[PDB]
Amino acid sequence: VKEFLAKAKEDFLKKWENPAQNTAHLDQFERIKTLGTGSFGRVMLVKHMETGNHYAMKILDKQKVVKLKQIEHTLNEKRILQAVNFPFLVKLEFSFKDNSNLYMVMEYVPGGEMFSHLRRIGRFSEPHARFYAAQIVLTFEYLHSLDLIYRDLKPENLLIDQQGYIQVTDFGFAKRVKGRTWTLCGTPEYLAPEIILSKGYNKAVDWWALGVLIYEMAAGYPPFFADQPIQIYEKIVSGKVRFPSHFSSDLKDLLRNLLQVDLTKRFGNLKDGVNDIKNHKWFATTDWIAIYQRKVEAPFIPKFKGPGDTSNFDDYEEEEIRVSINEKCGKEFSEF
């Protein structure tokens, strides 16, 4: 492990210090359908004319990014994504920008969001949840070794590929930090107490988020929920967590250590780091090497009608992409 990560870091660093830029152009892609939306943009299924390959193109409105004060976060996102390389991280194939928008073209993951499947099915079995969780554990181990904090783990950001494996998407809040950081960001249900309490925090927030994810996958609902975020925040910092009767004792124990309000006791943040999670009883049947190599059989393989199929995604209202005649926010995104 240690040796693998060392070489991974060498590869990452070379790209981190000399990021790829302007590797394609809008006109090289055929826009097909919207697969998701956001505050400052959308993600569309596109077809690369020259290769016939399908990709997911994330379009960010520069003016909207600026209004929401997400310039640095957006620069972080592209700089980090173009530099990482892990089997469970979506690949950034191309990136460019025009007068109005920023574009990030990534590998298309046809199976749809875990969110969709989890909500439809209700809840995942422990072996099913364990399969996905293992992939997140390895991914965070990879990301953290690179001094990267992810900060946006949730079913909505995890896509299922053709082999039933996970693809982590959305690096909008990812940041390379060696010390502590203070930005209030993430999703209500997944925010660690440190974040809510406005104090400096670190990679430990990702491990708390993992606890929330595992709980939600196995229960079908998050450990902390309410109709308004403030009420959710009150539950998170309270230090109280109730588990469904069907949760195994091993799962409950893992979750109590993951959803630990006390940082000096939260799994993933102790002196043994990720090993305290990897070696936990709940993960006893998990072969970490096999997971990384994708040789473990997936509990669920999505249905497909062919290339470019979007049946595993919801329908979103389409909107024309207008590129202004004038350059917008050029200096703010010069390094993109």
Binding site: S39, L68, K69, Q70, F115, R119, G122, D152, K154, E156, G172, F173, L184, C185, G186, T187, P188, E189, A219, G220, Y221, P222, F225, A226, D227, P229, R242, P244
Partner: peptide, 20 residues
């Protein structure tokens, strides 16, 4: 049941991230 409470909540759809 907690499940019934969740399904009846306004937070079963896609959850937006919080900025600033």
């Amino acid at each position: 049941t907690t499940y019934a409470d969740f399904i009846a909540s306004g937070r079963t759809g896609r959850r937006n991230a919080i900025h600033d």
